[PDB]
Symmetry: C3
Subunit: 258 residues, 3 copies
């Protein structure tokens, strides 16, 4: 059997590395580039301009590289960039983003995007993220490394999801989630930090201790964001993980989840 | 490139306008009628008795015209009627409704039904509505003109969604939503009115002022629904926009969302 | 019209009863077994080792028999077992479970799994259940007979859903649901007993009265779980349906939904 199934539709302008697999009844549209070791399943719709990296897996009934609704004018160049070693499960929908304003939809490496998850236009996903079933990013959402968004997490446009943060199932996020923070409910509320994920990553006892103290400064001692940021300056300069936490609060444009 | 893809299945009883486009591996079932300028994507399942009007676009993995789940008797005539200039995104599910008791599923014009949204049996959608991704109408839901249901809004059976109303993302609507009202949460709660939409629609400042006063009469002045409807009578006779609001509270069978 | 559509793919290792129907562009993967009178629609992905029983109906865009993430080692035997007279609606996702530890994913008889519902690895569904649209069982979830989970009900791993229990739409279940109990919200809260379900099943007036009495003992009389179970002992001995209620609280491992 051929690597590229004869029942698939491959546009002449698509560029696939020699060992790429495409399942039956899949469509690889114009301006779609697929890197080495990528496996496209059956019944997949790929639309471009889209660049897919190496060793990716894209499952049936997914629509990857869908139109950007934002378009300032008809024919504005758009793009979707996907990195390496990602898993895109069944029914996933991923929209492209605008090139001109550096707002392309981009996905990094080692991500797991589970069944029927949705990635809205201009969203940026880092590395080692998990977007569980039916998680939806409205648009212009930034998801930093190692974030875990539990099943049916909804993210309002322009929200930033901090590195190593966690949302509980069915969370509705309207504000920025600082790095490491665990959020739950509709509307989302901050509960704690994902200390479990810190240990799995091999954070030192001292870095975990400073992060636990950092959480209290921000959420449990009646400080304003401005006051909290000044109180964390000292710890952030000493612990890169605390600087990650402080930086996410500093870069919050929609306020932080409380 | 042939308008009807040779890989599509067109039932001999289906009725199509000459320029209808049908993508590969799509099924246009028995008793499906498709109008001028409509584009059916690839991998679409159309089931009848269904009428799809002019200049519609139906995306991949959608199942349009599915069975009504609660017939009085087996073989009871059912129908789905879709108007013109609608966009039905990928994975959308739309069920038919019973003809006899005038409970057909009907969709008007210029609607946008986004990915994996669900339109249950006997639902009635007006014009210029937006049902964002994964919005679900359980059945017998009335959506009036210009309503916007944000992503993952769930609507209980028999609920009425008023004209120009708005639900926040992840809203679980169990009661009627009066016209212009903005609702949020699970269970949904009334917050304000969509004054933004009124301005985009070109409403006069006097109509907006009368609607703002109307919201207070119903929600912020400790009145009963009967008391509110009586106080609104004078304003409603003067502003058609206030009559739209008053009529939506009058026609509420499940009570109004508070 | 050929029972196995010539556009479907039947793996040479798949075992089918003679009268099985397979729609166009459907895949009956390796190690899939299908029983008498079963109808596979078009665009279905079946993956094994999976056993599908008799008189089942599987709708388009479903992925049934998907990989279990829970794997002790590569090549560990996995299985999905589906009984008879079930209806699996469009876009439904069902994962296999591990054999070695008696944790296979199993579905009994006469079940209705509605559009885009998700059955996570090692989940066990009994008979006559209804999983409404987009209900998601995270994994290791046990759903007893006649349970109804309303649209978008989310179920945390290891939860038990009792016989004849009910969840409201958009419920986020984190704890066990005792038999007959109705739950609502995110997080889910106990409200009452499913009296309509009791009436539909033709329960005696004495049984419906003893169950209403049982609910109050557990939830509205300030007793602890150990205190409630002791008071229930008498009514449970006389009424088998009260024993069903008592047994579900006794066998709770995540505490009971309150
Ligand atoms: N790879 C991985 C992975 C998966 C889930 C999570 C987080 N997680 C808990 C969990 N861990 N393993 C399982 O199966 O679930 C949830 O999102 C629960 S909700 C849910 C879960 C699955 C489907 C639908 C829904 Cl709604 C973390 C990592
Ligand atoms: N055409 C249009 C259109 C789209 C959305 C809305 C309403 N809206 C806000 C918004 N506006 N533009 C964007 O992308 O989102 C949401 O529903 C947010 S939630 C959401 C959004 C998208 C996917 C999944 C989810 Cl969960 C209003 C109009
Ligand atoms: N066969 C059956 C069956 C169906 C639903 C229920 C429970 N149920 C109420 C209801 N009863 N008939 C209808 O149509 O809805 C809901 O889940 C409402 S929410 C919902 C409903 C449908 C789609 C999406 C959503 Cl979100 C019980 C039994
Ligand atoms: Cl998945
Ligand atoms: Cl988008
Ligand atoms: Cl959770
Ligand atoms: Cl027409
Ligand atoms: Cl969409
Ligand atoms: Cl329906
Ligand atoms: Cl919102
Ligand atoms: Cl508002
Ligand atoms: Cl405004
Ligand atoms: Cl069998
Ligand atoms: Cl799989
Ligand atoms: Cl369904
Ligand atoms: Cl799973
Ligand atoms: Cl409900």
């Amino acid at each position: 059997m051929s690597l590229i199934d004869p029942r698939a539709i491959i546009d002449p302008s698509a560029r696939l590395a020699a060992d790429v697999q495409v399942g039956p009844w899949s469509i690889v549209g114009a301006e779609v580039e697929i890197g080495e070791g990528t496996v496209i399943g059956p019944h997949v719709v790929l639309k471009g301009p889209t660049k897919i990296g190496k060793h990716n897996r894209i499952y049936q009934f997914s629509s990857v590289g869908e139109d950007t609704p934002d378009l300032k004018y008809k024919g504005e160049p758009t793009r979707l960039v996907i990195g390496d070693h990602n898993v895109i499960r069944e029914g996933v929908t991923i929209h492209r983003g605008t090139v001109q304003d550096r707002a392309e939809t981009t996905i990094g490496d080692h991500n797991l995007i589970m069944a029927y998850a949705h990635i809205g236009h201009d969203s940026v996903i880092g590395n080692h993220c998990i977007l569980v079933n039916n998680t939806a990013l409205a648009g212009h959402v930034h998801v930093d490394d190692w974030a875990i968004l539990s099943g049916y997490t909804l993210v309002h446009q322009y929200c930033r999801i901090g590195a190593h943060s966690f949302s509980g199932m069915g969370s509705a996020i309207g504000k920025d989630v600082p790095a490491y923070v665990t959020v739950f409910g509709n509307p989302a509320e901050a509960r704690s930090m994902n200390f479990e994920g810190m240990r799995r990553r091999g954070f030192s006892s001292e870095a975990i201790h400073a992060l636990r103290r950092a959480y209290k400064v921000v959420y449990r001692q009646g400080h304003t964001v401005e006051e909290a940021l000044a109180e964390l300056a000292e710890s952030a300069a000493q612990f890169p993980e605390v600087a990650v936490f402080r930086d996410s609060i500093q870069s919050a444009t929609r306020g932080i989840t409380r």
